[PDB]
Amino acid sequence: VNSFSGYLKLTDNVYIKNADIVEEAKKVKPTVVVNAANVYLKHGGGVAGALNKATNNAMQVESDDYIATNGPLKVGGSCVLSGHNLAKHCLHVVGPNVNKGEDIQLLKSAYENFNQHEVLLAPLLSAGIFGADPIHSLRVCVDTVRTNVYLAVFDKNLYDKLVSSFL
Numbered sequence: 001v002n003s004f005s006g007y008l009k010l011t012d013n014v015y016i017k018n019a020d021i022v023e024e025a026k027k028v029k030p031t032v033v034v035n036a037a038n039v040y041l042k043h044g045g046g047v048a049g050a051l052n053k054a055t056n057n058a059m060q061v062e063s064d065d066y067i068a069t070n071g072p073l074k075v076g077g078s079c080v081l082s083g084h085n086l087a088k089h090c091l092h093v094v095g096p097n098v099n100k101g102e103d104i105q106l107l108k109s110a111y112e113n114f115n116q117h118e119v120l121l122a123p124l125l126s127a128g129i130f131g132a133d134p135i136h137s138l139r140v141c142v143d144t145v146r147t148n149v150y151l152a153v154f155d156k157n158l159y160d161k162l163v164s165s166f167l
């Protein structure tokens with residue numbers, strides 16, 4: 001038993017809710033919140049900006065130190081950093097950005113990072129401003145992640161569409 005509330009069950013291990021991931025993280029304070037990162041950990045917009053804004057920019061300060069030491073992530077890759085005021089840990093995962101020309105085939109590699117954590121609060125990787133088809137991203141999630149994933153879909157209309165179209 002855990003602390004997540006009002007999620008629809010999609011599969012044995014995947015749950016979904018129409019929720020702001022920031023508000024969800026503040027309420028639940030999960031062990032792991034997933035950030036929809038880029039390889040530079042430049043948290044300008046979307047989930048990264050909203051999460052970063054909610055940390056008062058501490059996520060970006062930590063991230064710049066991480067990049068200065070380690071260099072950029074790989075598309076499909078991840079790193080674990082602090083969750084600050086939102087979670088124990090933040091798993092920064094780089095899904096391919098279709099709007100930057102990145103290969104959508106790397107989405108499965110991105111979701112494999114979630115398997116290193118027993119429970120995660122996560123967004124829909126490569127969807128929204130990443131340019132991928134969110135229906136596809138949910139299918140790859142369900143077909144790749146074996147650990148317990150709580151998907152927070154921000155967009156109301158998109159949440160309804162994902163549930164109604166889910167096989």
Ligand SMILES: O=C(O)Cc1cc2ccccc2s1
Pocket residue numbers: 036045046047048123124125126127128129130152153154155158
């Ligand atoms: O939750 C949503 O509505 C769908 C989105 C996924 C995502 C990923 C990165 C950046 C923004 C967004 S919006």
